[PDB]
Design an enzyme around this catalytic site. Structure first.
Site, PDB file in Angstrom:
ATOM      1  N   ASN A  34      23.367 -10.975  -6.579  1.00  0.00           N
ATOM      2  CA  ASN A  34      24.447 -10.050  -6.263  1.00  0.00           C
ATOM      3  C   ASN A  34      24.745 -10.021  -4.764  1.00  0.00           C
ATOM      4  O   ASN A  34      23.805 -10.023  -3.971  1.00  0.00           O
ATOM      5  CB  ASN A  34      24.020  -8.656  -6.678  1.00  0.00           C
ATOM      6  CG  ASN A  34      25.183  -7.700  -6.748  1.00  0.00           C
ATOM      7  OD1 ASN A  34      26.326  -8.104  -7.009  1.00  0.00           O
ATOM      8  ND2 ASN A  34      24.908  -6.447  -6.492  1.00  0.00           N
ATOM      9  N   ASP A 104      17.231 -13.175  -5.388  1.00  0.00           N
ATOM     10  CA  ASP A 104      17.754 -11.845  -5.728  1.00  0.00           C
ATOM     11  C   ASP A 104      17.836 -11.722  -7.257  1.00  0.00           C
ATOM     12  O   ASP A 104      16.845 -11.965  -7.936  1.00  0.00           O
ATOM     13  CB  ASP A 104      19.116 -11.632  -5.047  1.00  0.00           C
ATOM     14  CG  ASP A 104      19.693 -10.246  -5.301  1.00  0.00           C
ATOM     15  OD1 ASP A 104      19.137  -9.253  -4.780  1.00  0.00           O
ATOM     16  OD2 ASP A 104      20.709 -10.166  -6.021  1.00  0.00           O
ATOM     17  N   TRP A 105      19.002 -11.411  -7.819  1.00  0.00           N
ATOM     18  CA  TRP A 105      19.088 -11.329  -9.281  1.00  0.00           C
ATOM     19  C   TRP A 105      18.975 -12.683  -9.972  1.00  0.00           C
ATOM     20  O   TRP A 105      18.620 -12.756 -11.151  1.00  0.00           O
ATOM     21  CB  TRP A 105      20.311 -10.526  -9.730  1.00  0.00           C
ATOM     22  CG  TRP A 105      20.044  -9.052  -9.660  1.00  0.00           C
ATOM     23  CD1 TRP A 105      20.532  -8.165  -8.740  1.00  0.00           C
ATOM     24  CD2 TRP A 105      19.212  -8.297 -10.544  1.00  0.00           C
ATOM     25  NE1 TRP A 105      20.055  -6.905  -9.003  1.00  0.00           N
ATOM     26  CE2 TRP A 105      19.242  -6.958 -10.105  1.00  0.00           C
ATOM     27  CE3 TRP A 105      18.439  -8.624 -11.671  1.00  0.00           C
ATOM     28  CZ2 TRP A 105      18.530  -5.942 -10.749  1.00  0.00           C
ATOM     29  CZ3 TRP A 105      17.731  -7.609 -12.307  1.00  0.00           C
ATOM     30  CH2 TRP A 105      17.782  -6.286 -11.842  1.00  0.00           C
ATOM     31  N   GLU A 128      13.357 -14.002  -1.311  1.00  0.00           N
ATOM     32  CA  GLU A 128      13.989 -12.672  -1.261  1.00  0.00           C
ATOM     33  C   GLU A 128      14.310 -12.245  -2.702  1.00  0.00           C
ATOM     34  O   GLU A 128      15.477 -11.965  -3.090  1.00  0.00           O
ATOM     35  CB  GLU A 128      15.209 -12.724  -0.325  1.00  0.00           C
ATOM     36  CG  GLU A 128      14.816 -12.480   1.136  1.00  0.00           C
ATOM     37  CD  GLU A 128      14.389 -11.037   1.379  1.00  0.00           C
ATOM     38  OE1 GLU A 128      15.152 -10.128   1.007  1.00  0.00           O
ATOM     39  OE2 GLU A 128      13.310 -10.807   1.957  1.00  0.00           O
ATOM     40  N   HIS A 269      18.259 -10.923   4.105  1.00  0.00           N
ATOM     41  CA  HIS A 269      18.263 -11.070   2.642  1.00  0.00           C
ATOM     42  C   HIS A 269      19.003 -12.313   2.134  1.00  0.00           C
ATOM     43  O   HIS A 269      18.434 -13.110   1.360  1.00  0.00           O
ATOM     44  CB  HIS A 269      18.786  -9.803   1.944  1.00  0.00           C
ATOM     45  CG  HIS A 269      18.735  -9.901   0.451  1.00  0.00           C
ATOM     46  ND1 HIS A 269      17.548  -9.994  -0.242  1.00  0.00           N
ATOM     47  CD2 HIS A 269      19.718 -10.016  -0.472  1.00  0.00           C
ATOM     48  CE1 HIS A 269      17.800 -10.122  -1.531  1.00  0.00           C
ATOM     49  NE2 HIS A 269      19.110 -10.132  -1.699  1.00  0.00           N
TER      50      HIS A 269
HETATM   51 CL   LIG Z   1      21.617  -5.579  -6.466  1.00  0.00          CL
END
Ligand SMILES: [Cl-]
Ligand SMILES: [Cl-]
Lengths: 290, 290
Positions: A34, A104-105, A128, A269
């Site tokens: 995301n 992330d996702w 990350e 990030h």
């Molecule tokens: Cl998120």
């Protein structure tokens, strides 16, 4: 758009899903999170060209993938992303000797996939990434805590659907450099339209497993984290300096995992935008040894 | 609260202005900008203890200084901040042999003060400072370009007075590390109440000289930048890596100024939170040579 021109399309559950696909061999699968898209990997993938079949899907309702019909508050959950991505992965013949490169996702989706296809995985490179569930907000990065909590309230719809605050506030705050207008525009592009087009970027923060919520995601992550702690599958931890999600004590826990190689690159990030060549070189070198 | 308990108060145009004041001798004046306060300097000032009279004021409507009466769209302009700060400095007897340590709008005020009091200035140490007017938006950092554009539009009041976005989004996005909840709360404190208490954090972005607007600020900034290029007054440029406001070709321009010493420290915009000791040591060593 020369990158965007390179995308292929596949019909998945009746939806057109975009993906990069270059080369042949065992799949090397790059998974964004995301509010990004396969575009996040554009400067990393050439480091793996010729090392396998490189695949970077645009998640459903993201990048150049179709948006869902009758989009609402319950649309674009983790499970739903699974349905489309897993099916896409199936249709693309991604079933054996898979190397995952995840963030992330994308890491939630990738780790879960590897956990449920444990015999199909050659190695996992992550950065990350979602490597824990959170019992309290106290362990959530202060950088985004207030913003995330506000997103976990009715205010989220206004922030995201109307104001596009995940893209406009949270992206640039977690990149060291300035993006070019061109790059930031490509990140805006799937979400330029106010309203439901921006729904993926709001559901994702609402799916982050905090204090048992959501129950399905919390259990799912807890399961794969336990398994990552035991599996002999080779792991490449791309650590970030200073990092955002994986810092302090989390790092110590990740470092206890078996058969783990670690490289540190500069970044917050969205580290692909700060250190793409260091990331790509690290992934290529590690992959070569598998 | 042991830091806030240290603040002294002075009545300036009928208003209470808070300030840190420690020690005796020639004044060393630390000027914060938006949306911060004297708290930003807390880890830097001890490096100058015993080197002079240390003074860190809270700008009007900020830190522990009073809010203005009948606050609205025309309040807390640069001109108004000068009116209050310059009066405070005169009332504190800051009139000769002054060393300035300045940041952000603190540097706009400090540079202007120095330009208009050129025989009173011993040295100017600056970081992430206002060192140019911008001829186009393309030269404004992408990190907060859309945010600033939105803030300068009529959308600004909603973003700041109601949502407090400068404090909540722009501060953590421009510090490398994670602040503690305690540190973030101190920056939140002067702006805890929705409405006009948050106006200083809105008028500041509206005062940045871009494409000739505002006219008064553009002219005074052009004027002091012209002068900084000529004056023999010793200058310490604390460059930030990667930095936000002073990056790329801006650095080249600043580097052309006479009698300039340069040190680079890690940081984005609010660099005092990332490299306080490096900044303090650099200021101390440079000040020693004046
Ligand atoms: Cl998120
Ligand atoms: Cl500002």
């Amino acid at each position: 758009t020369s990158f965007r021109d390179k995308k292929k399309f596949a019909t998945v559950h009746g939806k057109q899903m975009a993906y990069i696909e270059e080369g042949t061999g065992d799949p090397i699968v790059f998974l964004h999170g995301n509010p990004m898209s396969s575009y996040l990997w554009r400067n990393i993938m050439p480091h793996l060209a010729g090392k396998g079949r490189l695949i970077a899907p645009d998640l459903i309702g993201m990048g150049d993938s179709d948006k869902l019909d009758n989009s609402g508050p319950d649309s674009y959950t983790f499970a739903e992303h699974c349905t489309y991505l897993f099916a896409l992965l199936e249709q693309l013949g991604v079933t054996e000797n898979v190397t995952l490169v995840i963030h992330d996702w994308g890491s939630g989706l990738g780790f879960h996939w590897a956990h449920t296809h444990s015999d199909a995985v050659k190695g996992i490179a992550f950065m990350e990434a979602i490597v824990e569930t959170r019992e309290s907000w106290d362990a959530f990065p202060e950088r985004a805590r207030e913003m995330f909590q506000a997103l976990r309230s009715p205010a989220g719809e206004e922030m995201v659907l109307e104001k596009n605050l995940f893209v406009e506030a949270l992206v640039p705050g977690s990149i060291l450099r300035d993006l070019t207008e061109e790059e930031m525009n490509e990140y805006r592009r799937p979400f330029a339209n106010a309203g439901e087009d921006r729904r993926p970027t709001l559901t994702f923060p609402r799916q982050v497993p905090i204090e048992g919520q959501p129950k399905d995601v919390t259990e799912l992550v807890d399961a794969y984290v336990d398994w990552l702690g035991q599996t002999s599958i080779p792991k490449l931890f791309i650590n970030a300096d200073p990092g955002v999600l994986i810092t302090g004590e989390v790092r110590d826990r990740v470092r206890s995992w078996p058969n783990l190689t670690e490289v540190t690159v500069a970044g917050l990030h969205f580290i692909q935008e700060d250190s793409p060549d260091e990331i790509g070189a690290a992934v290529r070198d590690w992959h070569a040894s598998l």
